Structure formats: C-alpha cells, structure tokens
Design an enzyme around this catalytic site. Structure first.
Site, mmCIF file in Angstrom:
data_model
loop_
_atom_site.group_PDB
_atom_site.id
_atom_site.type_symbol
_atom_site.label_atom_id
_atom_site.label_comp_id
_atom_site.label_asym_id
_atom_site.label_seq_id
_atom_site.Cartn_x
_atom_site.Cartn_y
_atom_site.Cartn_z
ATOM 1 N N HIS B 41 0.812 -1.207 0.000
ATOM 2 C CA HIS B 41 0.000 0.000 0.000
ATOM 3 C C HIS B 41 0.852 1.267 0.000
ATOM 4 O O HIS B 41 0.290 2.366 0.007
ATOM 5 C CB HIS B 41 -0.988 -0.018 1.179
ATOM 6 N N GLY B 143 3.210 4.489 10.784
ATOM 7 C CA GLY B 143 4.573 4.396 10.312
ATOM 8 C C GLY B 143 5.254 3.071 10.615
ATOM 9 O O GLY B 143 6.404 2.867 10.214
ATOM 10 N N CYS B 145 4.249 0.104 9.624
ATOM 11 C CA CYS B 145 4.058 -0.879 8.568
ATOM 12 C C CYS B 145 5.385 -1.277 7.960
ATOM 13 O O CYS B 145 6.280 -0.447 7.768
ATOM 14 C CB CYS B 145 3.129 -0.324 7.487
HETATM 15 C C1 LIG Z 1 0.560 0.975 7.536
HETATM 16 C C2 LIG Z 1 0.759 1.607 8.924
HETATM 17 O O1 LIG Z 1 1.786 2.119 9.256
HETATM 18 C C3 LIG Z 1 -0.408 1.567 9.895
HETATM 19 C C4 LIG Z 1 -0.203 0.843 11.182
HETATM 20 C C5 LIG Z 1 -1.520 1.019 12.016
HETATM 21 C C6 LIG Z 1 -1.971 2.377 11.943
HETATM 22 C C7 LIG Z 1 -2.798 2.733 13.067
HETATM 23 C C8 LIG Z 1 -1.942 2.695 14.284
HETATM 24 N N1 LIG Z 1 -1.288 1.343 14.609
HETATM 25 C C9 LIG Z 1 -1.064 0.422 13.405
HETATM 26 O O2 LIG Z 1 -0.592 -0.689 13.486
HETATM 27 N N2 LIG Z 1 -1.396 0.765 9.202
HETATM 28 C C10 LIG Z 1 -2.538 1.333 8.570
HETATM 29 O O3 LIG Z 1 -2.683 2.510 8.631
HETATM 30 C C11 LIG Z 1 -3.457 0.382 7.803
HETATM 31 C C12 LIG Z 1 -3.216 0.607 6.298
HETATM 32 C C13 LIG Z 1 -3.919 -0.495 5.507
HETATM 33 C C14 LIG Z 1 -4.065 -0.224 4.020
HETATM 34 C C15 LIG Z 1 -3.198 -1.832 5.672
HETATM 35 N N3 LIG Z 1 -4.812 0.597 8.170
HETATM 36 C C16 LIG Z 1 -5.215 0.287 9.514
HETATM 37 O O4 LIG Z 1 -4.441 -0.107 10.305
HETATM 38 C C17 LIG Z 1 -6.647 0.537 9.943
HETATM 39 C C18 LIG Z 1 -7.539 1.235 9.155
HETATM 40 C C19 LIG Z 1 -8.740 1.291 9.869
HETATM 41 C C20 LIG Z 1 -9.973 1.872 9.538
HETATM 42 O O5 LIG Z 1 -10.033 2.521 8.289
HETATM 43 C C21 LIG Z 1 -11.028 3.493 8.201
HETATM 44 C C22 LIG Z 1 -11.040 1.789 10.437
HETATM 45 C C23 LIG Z 1 -10.841 1.130 11.662
HETATM 46 C C24 LIG Z 1 -9.602 0.548 11.978
HETATM 47 C C25 LIG Z 1 -8.538 0.638 11.055
HETATM 48 N N4 LIG Z 1 -7.254 0.175 11.088
#
Ligand SMILES: *CC(=O)[C@H](C[C@@H]1CCCNC1=O)NC(=O)[C@H](CC(C)C)NC(=O)c1cc2c(OC)cccc2[nH]1
Ligand SMILES: *CC(=O)[C@H](C[C@@H]1CCCNC1=O)NC(=O)[C@H](CC(C)C)NC(=O)c1cc2c(OC)cccc2[nH]1
Lengths: 303, 306
Positions: B41, B143, B145
């Site tokens: 992503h 950050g 990921c």
């Molecule tokens: C990729 C990254 O660095 C983060 C890590 C997450 C972010 C939130 C804080 N702790 C953590 O581990 N990951 C993301 O942002 C994810 C990106 C995806 C495309 C894999 N998304 C989520 O973690 C996520 C999104 C989301 C949501 O979207 C509206 C609603 C409820 C919960 C939720 N989690």
C-alpha cells in the site's frame, strides 16, 4: 496502539560482546575500542571464593593467562588493569564495530535493556528496572556475568550495568562499567541481602496513563488530591514519595490524555485502598511499576 | 534463575531494515540480497482507499518513482513486481549484511520477536504470539508498517511476519513474507473484526513447567486426568483443546522436571476451577500463554545464537 515490555534493539551491543577465560572460569566481556571490560572475579580460583585478594591474584597473572575470543577468533591481550570490580584487558586490536557510547550510572527507578549472554554469545534481550534497593529482577544463569545493561539515545549507547551476582532471594546485582556495585554488594561467594524494596510511584502513574491511552479506564474517578495528602497514603502502602519533579515529568502524558497528574493520583489512592477486585489493567492483575514516563511516551505518543 | 519475556537478539535484522517511499507514503522495507520487500500500500494515494485496485496502480508506477533509503544511502530500484500483498523491489546493490535466512509461515500459538521500526529506524524489540484468531497483540503506531517478526532457529533468521494493520479492538494483523495475510484480513483502509480468541493451552502448561524449574511448586497436585477429560473443562474456560501432539511437545520439559504432562494438566485444571486465592506464579497473578515449550527450554538452558 498496544503496550509491551520493549527493549532497545541490541545490534550495537551485540557487536561488542566477547568471551574472556582465565583457568576454568569463562564469562562475557565488552570490547570497546582496544579494551575489553569484564568482571574481575574471572581471575579467581574456586579455592579462594570467600574473600578473594584481587590485587594480589592479578599481579600473579600474565597477559597469556587470558583467553579473549570475539566470535571465536582469539584477541591477543597486551596489558591488564583493575578498576574497582572490573578488569580492563587492553588487546592488540580495536573493535571495528565500537559504537558511539557512554558509561553512565543510573538512578533507582530508571530502566534499561539487558542482553543476556553465555560464552560471549547473545541469548536474548529484555528490559529491567533498577529497584529502590538496587537489585534487578532478571533472567540470568551461571556463566552470564559480564552481560551488560544499556539504553540507546539516537546513535549513542549508554552502558549502565554489568552483571555479577544472584542473591538468595532470586534477584540480581551488578556494577556500573567502572566496577562500582549498585547497592551494598561485594563480589565474594557469599549470601548477601538487599535493603527492603519499595514501589516506584512515578512509574505506576506512567503505567496508568498507558492504560488510559489504550482504552482501559475503569479505575478513573471524578476526584483529585493534593501532592501532600497523596504522599500520606503512599507512605502507608510502601510507595516512594511523589515529587514535584515527578509531576512535571508526567506532563506530556497528562497533556495527551487530558487527565491531570493529581487526578491520576486520586485514582491510584483508590486502587491502593480498595484493590482491583478481580479486574485487570493492561493485561495485569497487579499494579506495575517497571515502566518509566519515558518508556510510556516512547510507545504511546504519536502526539 | 528468573523468568522473563525475552526477545531474540535483533542485530541480524537491524541491518536489513530500510525506508521505502512512493508518493505520499513512507513505510519500512526488508532488504535481503538485492531485493527489498515491503507492504504494497506504499503505492497508494489517499483517494480510493476503501478498495484500491493495486494491479492498475502498479503499472502507472516506474522504478524511478520508488525511493528506497538504507540509512543515509539511497538504493537505485531497477525492477519491481507485486506478490500478494508485498512488493518485491529489485535494487542495484545486494545487502552485504544479509543473514542466513528463511521465509516461513507460522501457526497459531507460535511466538516470535518483533523489531518495531519507523521510517526505517529500529525503535524496539519485543516478543509476541500468533493468537488463535490470527491476530497479534502488538505495540504499533503509524509508520510501523513493514516492521517484521522473526525467530532465530539455531543459526538461521526465519522471517515470519510483516506488519500491516491495526483492528478496531486494538490488536494487529499482518502477512507472511510471501504477502499472504494471517487471518481473514485485507490491506484496505477499513474496520475489520477478528474471530473470538482463545487461550493457548499448551503454552500455559509450558509456563507452569518454567515456574517449577524456577522454584514455584505450590500448584502441583497428586491428582491425575486424561486428555479427553482435561479437554472437557478446557472448553468451559475457553482454552484450546490439548492434543496428543501438544503432549508430545511438552515431552522435553516433562523429562527435565520429572513431572508428567497429564499431572501438570491436572494442576492446570485445578487452577482454572479454583483460582490462585491470592497467590502468584513467576510474579504473575494470571496465567501466561505467550511462551512456547521451546521458549522455556531456550531460556532455562541458556541457548545462544552466534
Ligand atoms: C501501515 C501503517 O503504518 C499503519 C499501522 C496502524 C496504523 C494505526 C496505528 N497502529 C497500526 O498498526 N497501518 C494502517 O494505517 C493500515 C493501512 C492499511 C491499508 C493496511 N490501516 C489500519 O491499520 C486501519 C484502518 C482502519 C480503519 O479505516 C477506516 C477503520 C478502523 C480501523 C482501522 N485500522
Ligand atoms: C559469574 C556468573 O555468571 C554467576 C551468575 C549467578 C549464578 C547463579 C545463578 N544466577 C546468577 O546470576 N555469578 C556468581 O556465581 C557470583 C560470583 C561472585 C564472586 C560475584 N556468585 C553469586 O551470584 C552468589 C553466590 C552465593 C552464595 O555464596 C555461596 C550464597 C547464596 C547465593 C549466592 N549467589
């Protein structure tokens, strides 16, 4: 989100670990520039463990009586000296992986990462807190002496602990990297007792903040207290006094959550008086005190 | 003596962590030989975040659109392909600090070390378990990921996890290093729920053995039980069933302690039914399930890695 006991990455300290052997005694050392630091009792024979005469044993030793191995290649010793309870073995090679580093002495209540080693090789890494009675609660077996504790700031490794001993109660004692023990302990094959321990109040409050930030909130109440009145309850339960500096150090966590430090004190006082009655906080049924405010902010603050 | 949650030495992996940037996204990547592995992503723009079509997004990217940084050094990307949820970016230099390594996919109940990184900088290391619902209960911020989980198997670094997501409940979800998710999750910006979790019975028994080796012996009792009879109560308190294979895996610890697995099974069922009545085990007032049997052996036997 989430909260775990988190060590600093150990890579920089791994690259300085070596074994030191003298006779049938093997332990770990730290190779920095052209010096290897290790506990001095590596030079003791079992016949004289009760009160070794270190000064006097060391003059009888030569450089060739010492085996230093860095990743199993032998490092030649060209000089040796003693500083308190540590031995300094000057070797013919500078460690090419020496990191930027400091030797520091930590205060009780502060935490650091331990890299437990055997035969110069790492077994694992974990966090510890220096208790008010100057012991730590680790996982060390025979042969682990010379394992170090440390913290990392940006690119600099601050060594603060070198392991020496396991007390009869099962906790652990050691020195700073200048050979000076934390607490009233001596490097003799003798059963020694630690002072009475107390709980690190400022750390318990930092942990309650970590819990609130992560959604665990049932312990919060609508009250507040003064610093002086809280400390009266703290003393009653064998908790350290909370100082004005402790209040300021918690400022970042108070600002992130919107819960004033003295309000968190009122919640802790209630927890002390009424217990938890079967409820848990951040996965624990007891109040945890081995996380500093710094440890909590490092993990829980995007803010 | 003593018993602590202990992560593996993180040196071999530190030297493999890099930053990967594509458009507005910066995340972490894994640099092994001449390939950098990272979550896909990174090629995503915020628009159409609910169900991005990754196949199309990748064609409109070029090698020059991928900025890879290993510390101060920039790595030129000379090729790129997608594999499930990970991108494999071929770079012009092979990592001179690549370790002996494997990609493996682990099972529920197994543990590993996580090297939490942000923008390519290692921040901390901790131990985690793959839960029965294919989540981990980690400690991750924005950050993170691309941070990976791993084990050292004797002399080989076996990467098993690459972090992607945090669920609404606060737990974490991710993939193997081939890009296939653990659990029923997808890399899309949406709120996803996990199955109900259960307690990992075999690990709790392994921990009871660790306690014995360290002097705690009060919960030992003289009763006996069968695996079928044990499993019947395990289900009442939400424990995974204990299989004969699990019993075989506790074999080594049973030998070291001289306590048969099923007498420990009898000890555990008393514990569940009656509590600890104020008592603690290895300093804990609850039962732990994130130590595998080998984790106990590794630690109480001083296993090292070199
Ligand atoms: C990729 C990254 O660095 C983060 C890590 C997450 C972010 C939130 C804080 N702790 C953590 O581990 N990951 C993301 O942002 C994810 C990106 C995806 C495309 C894999 N998304 C989520 O973690 C996520 C999104 C989301 C949501 O979207 C509206 C609603 C409820 C919960 C939720 N989690
Ligand atoms: C050098 C080394 O690796 C060990 C580490 C100890 C060994 C026991 C298990 N855990 C642990 O950390 N260090 C020592 O053995 C100490 C050597 C001193 C000269 C520094 N001795 C002790 O730690 C020790 C001695 C002793 C005793 O004397 C007979 C009675 C009761 C307890 C006790 N601990």
């Amino acid at each position: 989100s989430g909260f775990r006991k988190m060590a600093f990455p150990s890579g920089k300290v791994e690259g300085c670990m070596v074994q030191v052997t003298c006779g049938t005694t093997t332990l770990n050392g730290l190779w920095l520039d052209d010096v290897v630091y290790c506990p001095r009792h590596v030079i003791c024979t079992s016949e004289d463990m009760l009160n070794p005469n270190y000064e006097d044993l060391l003059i009888r030793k030569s450089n060739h009586n010492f085996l230093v191995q860095a990743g199993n290649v032998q490092l030649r010793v060209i000089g040796h000296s003693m500083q308190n309870c540590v031995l300094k073995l000057k070797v013919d090679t500078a460690n090419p992986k020496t990191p930027k580093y400091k030797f520091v002495r930590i205060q009780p209540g502060q935490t650091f990462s331990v890299l437990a080693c055997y035969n110069g090789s790492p077994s694992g890494v974990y966090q510890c807190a220096m208790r008010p009675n100057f012991t730590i609660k680790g996982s060390f077996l025979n042969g682990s002496c010379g394992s170090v504790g440390f913290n990392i700031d940006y690119d600099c490794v601050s060594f603060c602990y070198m392991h020496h001993m396991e007390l009869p109660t099962g906790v652990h004692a050691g020195t700073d990297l200048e050979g000076n023990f934390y607490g009233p302990f001596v490097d003799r094959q003798t059963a020694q007792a630690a002072g009475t321990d107390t709980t690190i109040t400022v750390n318990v409050l930092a942990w309650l903040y970590a819990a609130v930030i992560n959604g665990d909130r049932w312990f919060l109440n609508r009250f507040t207290t003064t610093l002086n009145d809280f400390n009266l309850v703290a003393m009653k339960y064998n908790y350290e006094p909370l100082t004005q500096d402790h209040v300021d150090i918690l400022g970042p966590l108070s600002a992130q959550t919107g819960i004033a430090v003295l309000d968190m004190c009122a919640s802790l006082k209630e927890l002390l008086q009424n217990g938890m009655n079967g409820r848990t906080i951040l996965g624990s049924a007891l109040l945890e005190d081995e996380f500093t405010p710094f440890d909590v902010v490092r993990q829980c603050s995007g803010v």
